[PDB]
Amino acid sequence: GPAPGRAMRSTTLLALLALVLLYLVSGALVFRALEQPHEQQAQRELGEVREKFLRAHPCVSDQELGLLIKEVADALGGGADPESHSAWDLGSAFFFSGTIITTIGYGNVALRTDAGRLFCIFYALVGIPLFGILLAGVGDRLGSSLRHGIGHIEAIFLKWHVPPELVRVLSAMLFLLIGCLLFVLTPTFVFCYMEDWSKLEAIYFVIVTLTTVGFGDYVAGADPRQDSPAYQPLVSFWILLGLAYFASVLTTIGNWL
Amino acid sequence: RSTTLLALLALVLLYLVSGALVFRALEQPHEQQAQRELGEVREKFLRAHPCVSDQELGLLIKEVADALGGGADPETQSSHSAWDLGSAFFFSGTIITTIGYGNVALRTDAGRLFCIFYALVGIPLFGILLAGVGDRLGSSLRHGIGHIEAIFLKWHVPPELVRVLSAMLFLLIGCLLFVLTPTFVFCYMEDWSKLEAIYFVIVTLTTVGFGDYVAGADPRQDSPAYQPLVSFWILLGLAYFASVLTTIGNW
Numbered sequence: 001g002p003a004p005g006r007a008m009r010s011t012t013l014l015a016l017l018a019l020v021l022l023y024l025v026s027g028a029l030v031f032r033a034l035e036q037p038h039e040q041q042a043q044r045e046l047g048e049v050r051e052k053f054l055r056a057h058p059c060v061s062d063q064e065l066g067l068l069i070k071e072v073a074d075a076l077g078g079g080a081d082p083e084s085h086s087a088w089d090l091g092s093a094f095f096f097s098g099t100i101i102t103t104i105g106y107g108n109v110a111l112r113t114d115a116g117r118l119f120c121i122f123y124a125l126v127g128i129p130l131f132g133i134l135l136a137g138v139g140d141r142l143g144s145s146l147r148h149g150i151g152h153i154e155a156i157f158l159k160w161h162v163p164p165e166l167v168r169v170l171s172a173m174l175f176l177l178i179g180c181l182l183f184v185l186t187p188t189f190v191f192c193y194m195e196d197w198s199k200l201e202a203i204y205f206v207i208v209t210l211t212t213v214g215f216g217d218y219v220a221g222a223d224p225r226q227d228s229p230a231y232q233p234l235v236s237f238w239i240l241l242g243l244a245y246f247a248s249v250l251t252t253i254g255n256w257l
Numbered sequence: 258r259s260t261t262l263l264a265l266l267a268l269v270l271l272y273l274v275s276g277a278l279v280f281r282a283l284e285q286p287h288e289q290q291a292q293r294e295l296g297e298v299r300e301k302f303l304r305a306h307p308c309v310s311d312q313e314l315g316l317l318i319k320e321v322a323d324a325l326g327g328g329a330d331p332e333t334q335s336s337h338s339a340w341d342l343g344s345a346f347f348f349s350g351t352i353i354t355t356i357g358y359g360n361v362a363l364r365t366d367a368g369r370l371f372c373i374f375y376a377l378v379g380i381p382l383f384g385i386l387l388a389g390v391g392d393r394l395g396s397s398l399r400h401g402i403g404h405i406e407a408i409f410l411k412w413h414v415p416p417e418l419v420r421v422l423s424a425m426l427f428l429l430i431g432c433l434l435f436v437l438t439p440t441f442v443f444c445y446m447e448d449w450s451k452l453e454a455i456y457f458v459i460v461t462l463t464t465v466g467f468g469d470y471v472a473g474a475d476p477r478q479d480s481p482a483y484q485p486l487v488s489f490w491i492l493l494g495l496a497y498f499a500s501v502l503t504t505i506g507n508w
């Protein structure tokens with residue numbers, strides 16, 4: 001009814017369209033000044049690296065070095081450690097499978113085979129939607145489990161003569177802030193040391209992860225090697241519950257709108 | 258229902274295992290193969306030049322690793338900006354669509370902090386327009402078929418089956434304009450293989466966005482339309498492929 005109806009009005013879209021278009025333009029102008037100074041430090045920057053090895057070592061020709069770069073190119077282009085770290089063992093392959101259905105897709109360990117790409121194609125067409133079924137399912141019992149809990153302490157708020165305005169003015173904020181505590185503030189200060197990131201990196205990782213954006217610029221566990229069996233299912237378990245609570249909030253306020 | 262959930266949970270969990278098993282078989286050879294062959298080139302170049310120590314080589318192989326990771330082209334030796342307004346505009350399209358290629362990673366803390374607030378706002382905001390377009394796109398499209406549909410209902414074809422016929426044609430002309438045509442273009446303009454043009458589109462459409470393949474990211478192809486017009490298709494491609502998923506949930 002309202003979902004197509006509010007969009008059925010052509011003026012609502014085209015105004016929102018130009019809004020989004022210029023919302024993208026504004027973000028591009030900001031993103032430019034924030035990052036343009038420091039990105040392409042590789043294309044021409046390696047050019048000085050070659051000479052600083054042609055100068056540093058007269059014993060090596062440029063063509064010998066040119067082949068060396070081309071040799072290590074196909075080496076790095078398939079899996080090479082600049083120094084066990086197998087990125088396709090069942091542990092990490094399970095992680096890679098999860099990034100597909102969650103639509104996170106870090107791509108930090110991309111597919112090489114034309115057989116693996118085809119397998120992933122059908123794996124995504126079927127795997128992704130049925131994952132959302134379970135995620136929306138968990139959110140049903142998860143949201144109810146909080147409200148069971150939300151209700152118990154709610155009794156105390158109303159008794160202390162804070163008006164029926166309490167809801168809807170309070171029980172929404174405390175409901176989200178406890179989730180903001182458990183699935184954002186708690187993991188960040190954990191990940192701030194568990195991966196030894198800075199303050200913003202832990203927060204930046206969580207958001208891009210939970211928003212299913214998944215740049216792949218930040219997993220850093222393995223930062224060098226996965227190391228511990230703690231993180232492996234638990235973080236995916238955190239992502240799962242992170243998405244579930246994320247789903248609960250977007251759905252509940254969907255009703256309130 | 259807790260009965261369907263916990264049962265589906267084991268179904269989903271094993272679906273990941275079954276996927277991880279086959280993924281291992283199709284990738285563990287190729288990745289670990291190069292890991293062994295890298296040690297060869299380390300030896301092979303330590304042989305050719307005893308003048309160069311391994312530590313001085315260890316720095317270099319990491320420098321070229323830092324370079325190649327940055328997308329440094331090993332082809333010739335020595336402008337096409339990445340954070341130019343045209344591609345930075347496309348970069349914003351990666352977050353709000355939750356595609357997030359990550360091919361051009363961020364670096365500045367100010368850029369990441371601004372991206373934090375920009376992502377939280379833009380993503381549900383985009384979904385409103387996307388679904389909004391998908392409603393109007395589906396409506397304007399459904400408006401067009403009716404002309405042809407009126408002719409089809411004369412050949413004594415049962416209206417019960419006329420229902421099913423259009424349902425096929427709905428997705429067929431839909432994928433034709435948003436799967437076949439994009440892949441045939443990507444297989445041509447990017448000269449990717451058939452399994453790379455399809456692979457790019459699908460991973461992009463489902464917003465998985467591995468970033469390994471990105472159309473228009475190729476610095477050379479300077480056809481004036483290609484850079485943002487693909488993203489224009491991405492919008493319509495997202496809206497259509499998502500609107501079907503809603504009707505999929507119904508049927």
Ligand SMILES: [K+]
Binds near residue numbers: 103211356464
């Ligand atoms: K996504």
Ligand SMILES: [K+]
Binds near residue numbers: 105468
């Ligand atoms: K990515």
Ligand SMILES: [K+]
Binds near residue numbers: 326
């Ligand atoms: K990379």
Ligand SMILES: [K+]
Binds near residue numbers: 464
């Ligand atoms: K989505």
Ligand SMILES: [K+]
Binds near residue numbers: 103105213215464465
């Ligand atoms: K993604």
Ligand SMILES: [K+]
Binds near residue numbers: 105355
């Ligand atoms: K991604």
